[model samples]
Target: SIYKVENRHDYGTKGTKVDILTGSGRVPSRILDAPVVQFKESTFEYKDKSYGTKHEESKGNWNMKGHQFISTPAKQVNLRAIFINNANTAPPASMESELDISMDKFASDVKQLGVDFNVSGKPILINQFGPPIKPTFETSPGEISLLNLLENIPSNTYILYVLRRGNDSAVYDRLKYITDLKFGALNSCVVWDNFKKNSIQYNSNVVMKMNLKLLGSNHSLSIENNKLLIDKESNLPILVLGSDVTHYPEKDQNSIASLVGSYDDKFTQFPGDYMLQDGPGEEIITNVGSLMLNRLKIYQKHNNGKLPTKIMYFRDGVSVDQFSQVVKIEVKSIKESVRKFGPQLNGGNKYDPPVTCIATVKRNQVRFIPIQENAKNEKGEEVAVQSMGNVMPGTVVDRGITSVAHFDFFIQSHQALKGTGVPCHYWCLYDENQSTSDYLQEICNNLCYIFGRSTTSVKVPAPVYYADLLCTRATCFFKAGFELNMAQATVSKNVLLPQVNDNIKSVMYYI
Candidate 1:
């Protein structure tokens, strides 16, 4: 039943009406009901007859052919950010628009906030607070590069501030630089000065297209490349022997075959089986390790009995459970192969150089629930949550790069996520969110312990991207002036990136 309330006053009464839908109520102010919205379902009229009717589910994924429907889902929250300059400082009003900012207003704002510019020169302090997304940067002696500075600043959230700063436009204010840097980084951080413009001098969206030119040029790599020092092998060939078996008919085979079969016995008819790469097993454990061992031995012999100090892996989509196992094989293989080769093989370094096996993985259930839109609690209230990745621990296995492996299976989905025109995976997006604070910090520590690289800003996204760019540039030397099939190149052990090790460091990351 509908209940209506009319307002009246004793003196000069003006009537006010309120509507409520309930069986019995004392004019409930807030009611859970749909808004009266009329929608046109159809426009076609035949024989002077119109059949258009109002509909709610007329333009959604599950649009109805005939029947009533409702489009009621949980309402989501939107977040917005606000920038403040203290008494003596002023922040730019808009990203794409300009607003007049004076020095006195800026200084007055900061001064009013009781900020000490003499003690700490930086304008803003994005400390660990509120949503816990750390906006970080890499600081040099005199300057700083603000690469991906945010850990996970959720969208649609507002950031309010009371800013103050000096009105002097000529003053060397870092705030203006930081704000512009941040805005550009979020929208399109094209550091033409660093890689693109300095080198190519043209703006092209394709990273590969632009980077390929830079890769061939001299003075490209900022860091020293991993060298194959002993080229003369004393007639000992680099016998890189291994076996890689791809499983075809993924779903059906996953249900049926639970073991790693020989290529001749299983993959004789269908070569595409290698691409399927289904179900992890012990044979994969044995063979993958064995293959890596074999390759290490050959390289050791060629480099005066020395094994590769760094091991880069371009692993395909693997379940999270298999992460430890696949990595164990590569690491164990290197150690075992080193043991088998003796002291002469390592050049007597003793401690092994960090063996980095970067796996390209896809966590099936990884999703980014817009910080504002998530499954509510029992009380039907919004809260932050972290969901586990869906991965078959037992079904995890390693498909080593062996001589027996073919090129076709590796052609598709190789490092495709980071490239243009490729769809961004939810896991990657999630990784991007967590990369700065959690992942990069842990990685920096591990890398420092292992390789003695700089630890500060190691776990942060901007620094990590810089590191990745360094590695990618160094590796590109091996293929310089040689345009291999990118799809094939992407599947090579070292070519593809955005590794799981990188992603793991992102989660649980702190900078």
Candidate 2:
């Protein structure tokens, strides 16, 4: 049997203001209580300071004001930031005055993040250069300047790139691959406004991103108690993973595929692997067997020689036509992944773990809007208002609008501040786990709350979000700008993606 509902492909999001109530009566109670979510109230380590979702009543460093970092490195972090002007005109007349002040403030901001942070010296300046990445295959200006800076700094120094506002597709892409992939050190970029003046703008958000990249995280959750994570049949923990393939928008440019798996049980640490796929227009990952293998190795390393007895993978960007085909290809690779990985664990015994694959993640095709409900107004009158994102952020529909043949559901795992809620279309392509529908849906909805960045639950789970970031970060691996590769009509015979330094290969470097 084929699909009975008209599930359309998703597109770019729109900003509109309206309330949509799908149905309050039909809504499940768990969507409201958000059971496991409330469990996080006491989850943060008591010794260390931690914030609640960054959206709590007081959204500051209060809870973590004097608290120690969840995990601090043995040695202090040495970070060096420099300003590079890519504008057409000569250096701004303010030059040293404004730039120096900005650099000093940015420097001070990073020092506050729970580490023994040190800035080597005054911020350096490099101007009189053009864009970072060029259309032709010639060496770009940013590459040269980045090399110059790298030569000056000794080993174990992390670099922060400050760029003048311009075409980031041109200005920011070049140095990323060199600083991140070439050098083992973790680096982050912050865009300086070309035409701007504000000391009030302390750039705290920039400081937060820095913490995520340099330090692992301020808050960590624990699921240590005996409630979740163990597979019912094997009674072993599950290795949850997410994968996606991002093709260049233009024709025939190489596609990038990324795989990210949760290392720890709380799902706090995400170390992913990305590859440059030769297929230009393919949604299927060309080298997933190896990609999955690389991620499993990290999982094994993190879990102290333990291998997952079951695998739960969430794959994005699949279509109905390619369901069976993609499932066969990826599931086979999962088995192959352990075949090579099994020797390390069990002296070469045949290890075939049960695999569960869910797909076509976050498709805009279907959405949930609740039917209107009447509530008592302040004036003691019952007023009817349409319920939407703010209503609960948990509207799940599995019966009326799902596929007839396939097992699928529409879940608004997150709330939308800007109207028009886009629920993720989580369609299960294959399930050898023999789980109840509620078991899978409960885990899917619960994982949505576990993303580290957003204070609120995300549309899709954290693994897929991290996987998407890996592909985006991998674009710089192509020497020519990703755009340039897209503009060209044909594929190059030789395609190379240089591996990142091993120092960062196993960390959450993509953050």
Candidate 3:
């Protein structure tokens, strides 16, 4: 049945017929207030100490403040930075001078982020830093040699690496995979192009920021710490769970999915676990029940034996048609896991925790434009002034285009840095707490601030982003032929992922 508005008589119609949709005219609010932050007082024998650097105000939203590490290095170490000159792009003298200058800048910049940049011991530099070996197959024998050497280095020695720009792609790939996938070592990198320019005083802020993020990643430091202080309203400890799946192409062999849960009250620390399954059709997480139980155990042990009463799951990569399957499989598994470990009441009935499940989708055709208003300029002529270039960060649209029965909305949580911003579509499949749309939107928006990689609000929440990262890192483990065979041997639904090393299991080393 097609129902249309009949016969709207207009004295003069516009040049083109345009349709207008009604909006709810509502905006999402911040979930928590920003806390006042002060630099921790230095622990020294002297009772009083004068400030060496000028104090800056620690203020604004979670992303606004300059990040400070939870625990920084006592003193900058004399790092052994190895430069693999695969490109042969730089002359020896030019390369050496460039390396020295860049390292100096790096030391200086890192100090501002908190590490004491004391230079007593000189840095050790190794050029062409690998053994002379060429592989017959697509493998990096040189990188393997480098890793062996690095393994034998002094304990707790900081290692840095610089790779030539145009080398064998395997050499570059192995450099990344070996450090992160195998040893879980902290490292740094710079291509020859930027190195030459930075050496000649042609500094690029973008390149420096990349270097800083990589350095931060290498050291397992809290690069961008959250400053929001949220009070519990439901009297239940909140546990946020983010799940995502990375599907390979139809011709590819395997698919990997990751689940990350926040262990800390601040939601800053997310430890991830991943699984691999037979290609494309596997949307359901076969082993999520056990993973949830493990995370719950970790949370309870940390929180004085108090079990979480509230669980908010932000599920990613689900299509609209797959929503029912997600609820039936993934949601059911999570609930069963909770009920299995939930506290026993005075009566025979077990206490099940309240769960709020929201599906967060980034792949959509949804877009929003800022409202424009006419304003008088200095020349006394009317000019168009937009409220914002793209949709404002907290803008929420829920009524006109959303589902009538279900609670669904769109939020543009990040600023449009390049092209027009796309709002993330969120649907509340289940709300055990019966939270209002306002509160739910606020929670989603605030979660975007807790991503620790950068001091900027991300598109999705921290846990979801971490899950995506874990899936990507899982690929690194399967790059070698031996590793791929090992993974395929255990391709059952119950267990598919290769065993991660116990030494680095607890850390966000995948990040």
Candidate 4:
């Protein structure tokens, strides 16, 4: 379906023709000696055997860990429901029956996922059309309908909202704004489409997955024997940091950048901070210096007054050409933050911490095509097939096609399901750790298995993935119906945005 344009000739206005010849530029090619690097692999304790990177010959049973539930009440949790629809044409009786059955199953699934909740009450219906939908019992002004509902509900309660199919997208948008901003509670949406065949099963899977995250009972990925290689090998309290920026179109006013760091030594719980800026996709974060300073305090408190001496910073959303900006601006900003806080924490000793900044780039056209080998079919035909059928996970290539000046390497962290795998390029702009190529490769490869949200390994490191999630969560506060004045936001010192309630800020509710 997609093809590259090769032959080029352009026709302009008024019989104008331009011949666009395609030719390769003559550039000097240098052949340097490649380094002998071996990636130190880790395994996952799944089933009985430990499972590591998946290869072509790798076929095994590796299931994710069961739901690890925290403290939720044994009886019914305080829950309320509302169904939004037109009054005239109500939902069919069969649909209502199916919804009742689904709700029962939902309650059971919640219990299975290790949550105790009740679903006995009839949902309070709200008519979006015709007769008045706002219940007669509510006394708050009509202007603050959602806020009124929030005020009525008890804290730590859940809201089950049902929306009609084919309704305006703004309806859900406003609901998100009200729930996430006005009220910090667990909210779930069940659309009418779920009533259709095969839709309930599909959507319920998604909803249950979301519920697991909201309850903070999701399975966490770890290396076999429950060991964190970075912590064990380094023998130091290493702080893992991930930074990324989400850009918008030209018409959009603000871009959001997020920085997330692991507060615990397990490297599971990542607390994040956000900064909104004037331009679209500004690579350099303006308040990074102050933000990192705050993060250091949190880390120190979490580690019992001990600060991490080693910092592993994985930066995302940066292109190869923008490495200078990251080194000059972002890295410098981090050092400045360290210089400011290091003295206060270390008894006035200017503690210059060892920070390793690696730019992990995923946006590339490089594809690893496995070397073809001769194979035979049923008729003994010599068919060309991949030697291993797919590129092996943990494959590293550093010498060829790498920058001549910088210490960089390409690593395929995840196994490709169908197509050839695309490797992630890591450019080390600053490495106070003075790590070897193989050691860094091992660390990066192992870090991909630490994402708390998913049991399986992710494409990027856990902190990097968390940073991307945090950046996305920051945008929800700035969406429509929140009264965000972009013109005024553009004038603020750091482009002030809405803040989440302090009650749920520490937890990964955004998950």
Candidate 5:
């Protein structure tokens, strides 16, 4: 029986009089013993009354807008399946072909089930092994009972998952060992007969079972460097190209066998010395340039909606000659590639924003100090240079919307002499004067507003048009010249002090 709802306007209790006030200061005779009252729940017999058992009977209407459902569909059970890699040595047994079929079938099952696909069907090949599982098929009573006897499944299960893989001697051996030894439970399992010689034959009829819970908490952070990619044309991205050349000197070893005697008992010949006369290695310049461009492009894609319309770069360990020459080459290639397709991407579907080369030098005024090699800090944490005299050097960019808006950086090492009995622990120093650029400052302001560091009620400071010019110019220069041609209007370190102190600090970045 559902509870009936009553409206105040339909009841006499709304107009019932309460004699709480009287004109006289003293209580009146009528008020002394009899007090007016209203009985809303009781059924009234008088004609003026609107109360009765029928008036309060169940409404027979049930609405559950805010309430929860009394019952819900059962959650789909997930199944686990493992695939072993078919060796390339097999005679025409295509592992790829089998994988395609299996994966397709697995996906098709999900569509059939009309539930979330959470089934795991992966072949444990030599290297690749992670794919999200999607569930598909529903189990029948007879099939479930058969599985319970053969593979040890329980009735009335919440999640029903099955494992499909090929049945090989080695596979079953491993399975039985894992189950009998309590390594894992046995559920439905299948194995592809991939070892058949000279034919692409696989037996899909083999079945086995195991019970297992898939693990879901193994995440990792990876940094991609030196990646070169080309996306859609016309929507080209600003290119951040860096060039750094490294020198490796050759080592010399004497050949004792040749120098001494042919008859000497097994005289050994030493490897010839290889000198590093060639200034910088091609690998270094190529890698640095690739990293700069790759990261910039990635950043651009990540915040394609909000990236600046220019590209800026900072180059380290590159000679001015290399910077001037290599940057032009990279930029030319970028432009040519874009022209072949469509317009480069700027804010308005234009071609990719022009790139700017901010600086290319032996080192940046600021740099990155790694925690692992830090003997002084001991606390494995990356810190900026001011705290350590002559630490490491690297680049920092505006926390702009795009990733590639920054460049390479470095750090130096310094030692101080202690008086009397004290020894010197190396202290680091930073050229803060050269670190923060106007372009960088503009980036900071942009980030501040994006992240709500300032009042949300107002927009970014106006007269910021120059900031846009600076960003574009930086981008163009970097692309054309691959150098940091500092602006004459730069705020010098003498006037603007670098924010460095005893403790290491990090600046926040966002778009």
Candidate 6:
């Protein structure tokens, strides 16, 4: 069901494209060199396996533990620490000590990662008691303390809250509502249950996340500039896009629509823009035209007033049945938006660059089981370890299992560590790029390798995965009518979600 992220695990099988439907020709996925993680002043070209004498050298954490981020924010993000515990349910003294210790280690870990992790003030210890609570209740001692701190926090300092932690929704909702919507500054909090147990993994997860939230890119693709993702003659950069709509199971609940667009040349930076719609679980994006147009504006701003020559859109969360509907709605919006704006940028010349839209479908019944055999084991003999396992990280198939009308194919981009590998049926719903079957497949397969979190490939491209995460951010963006799931929320047209605040909107943020 879920694939693996580590590239060094030699458990998966590599597959080739099967030319059954298009008869275009079968080709093995081009194996590019390992990715190069860019830093502020240094970059490391990651090898397939970790390179140390013992397990300590190649345990996957070595590179991250040693490298600086691409860069810290131009503006400094001075941090302040807050440890809040309930007076009624106060944790043990040992727990409090452990929390501080973890926070200390976390701060230093981030410091080693190149961001200056300075705690501006002494850590605040709050023995705040949670008041009586109900679904209708809107305030609490926790929230009250949160507000008091935010009210006094300096303009530039970021807050890090350490809580005893709760599985309850109300406490966290209050904490999130105050810290996110009300204050709209950079911040993070950790629950002690997970934070107290296993070590650097948790700290680095949060630390790496914090670095990204602080507006620094953690890593990027290794390809040289202009060699890939560009039109040779035009030399204009490509605009990469990923879109998805998050829907709740209940009809009364609202849905989230998110669009993430690439602004930087390496395609490393994607500032996600999203909205909460009265979608009631609709699959189509409501304002894709405007969302994409907004992305173009940001791209131009980053690129010194230049627009892209091509657009590569990888859309997620759609089934094969809804493909036609998406074509008319989301695709129509993209075309119209580009058509309307192209003239403005080109001195009234029809500015329609090539647009390649692919429907990245993961909810299908099809799967691939690779045949395997292996090296000597404890008995000093060869073995077949690949039983009910997944395909290798770069396998793609476009044969009999494809669509008759479109250039649809399947790509198992990541190695599955626990379950059978399932491929993403990438349907070329619409293509103006006219790239060859091999080139298109290569581009799609290669995208899996550049996921920021892992050295191994991903099932979907990074933008699509980021868009799915961004879709959940709708809860933070849509505050007012969220408490009510009935009458007023049913009509999406009237309940437009607000644009994210300037600072929070600029980076991949809280969910």
Best by TM-score: 6
Candidate 4 lDDT, tens digit per residue, 224-244?
A: 312333455545458888888
TM-scores of all candidate predictions against the true structure: 0.23, 0.78, 0.72, 0.72, 0.22, 0.80
Q: 1-511 in candidate 6: lDDT tens per residue?
A: 1111111111112332221112243332222222344555665553332212222112112346666666666654677777767446667868756766766677676766666776546777666534324445545666676678788888778777676665644455445555665567777777767777737757766766676777666666554622567677766668889888877623455677788987766776677777665447777785687777667777778777777888988889887778777776777778888889867764677767677787798777776654432322234434322222443344556544555446676766665646766677777776676655556666676566555555445777777888887776555445433544243343453344556557676666652
Q: Which portions of model 2 show Cα errors greater than 4 Å? A: 1-32, 35-69, 72-74, 93-100, 103-116, 128-142, 194-204, 224-227, 231-236, 344-346, 372-391, 479-496
In candidate 3 the C-alpha lDDT for residue 504 amounts to: 44
Off by over 4 Å in 1: 1-245, 249-285, 293-315, 321-330, 341-360, 369-511
Per-candidate local distance difference test: 0.22, 0.60, 0.54, 0.56, 0.24, 0.62
Give the alpha carbon lDDT tens digit for every residue of 1-511 in model 2.
Answer: 2222223222112111124444443432123113333221333311111222323212111233323334444576676766767776666778656766666655564455444556645666766443334435555564677677776776656677767765665556566666677766677776667313433233444444455665455444345421455665655568888888888733556677888887656576677888877777677875577766656776677667767778888888677777776666776677777777777565566777777878856866454554444333334443332233243344455654566566787666675657676878888777777655666676676677656554456788778888888877776666434454454645452334556777777767677
Residue range with the least summed lDDT across 10 consecutive positions in model 5 = 255-264
TM-score winner, 2 or 5: 2
Model 5 CA RMSD to the hidden true structure, in angstroms:
32.5
Report the error of model 6 at residue 454, Å.
4.0
User: Which lDDT tens digits does candidate 5 get at residues 73-113?
Assistant: 24544433334332324323466566556544643333332
- Residues 1-511, candidate 3, lDDT per residue (tens digit)? 1111111111111111112122444322111222222222221110111122211111112221244444454545555556776653444666666677776775665555555443333444434433223423333455655767668766545555666655554455556556655676655455656654543222222222333333322112121222221226644447888888777622355666777776655565666677676565566676576567656766666677666777888888778777776777777778887777654321234757777778888867766664433333334444332223554354456645666666677666665666876778888776666577656766776676556655445677667777877777665454433333443463553333454554445556655
> Tens digits of per-residue lDDT for model 1 on 1-511?
1111111111111111122222232221110111111112221111111112312111101111231111111222221222232223233345112211221232223322221112111223222111101123224312222223333445422121222233422111232223222231111112211221222212111221211111111011011110111113332221211122222221222111111111110000100001112242222333243334333433454356545443333233334455455445534554465555445445555534333333332323221211121223334443222111111000101112111221110001111112221111111111111122112122222221111111111111122222333223222222221123232432432322111122211111110
> For model 2, what is the error of residue 19's alpha carbon versus the real structure, in angstroms, after optimal superposition?
14
* lDDT score, candidate 1, position 291: 34
RMSD versus native structure for model 6: 7.5
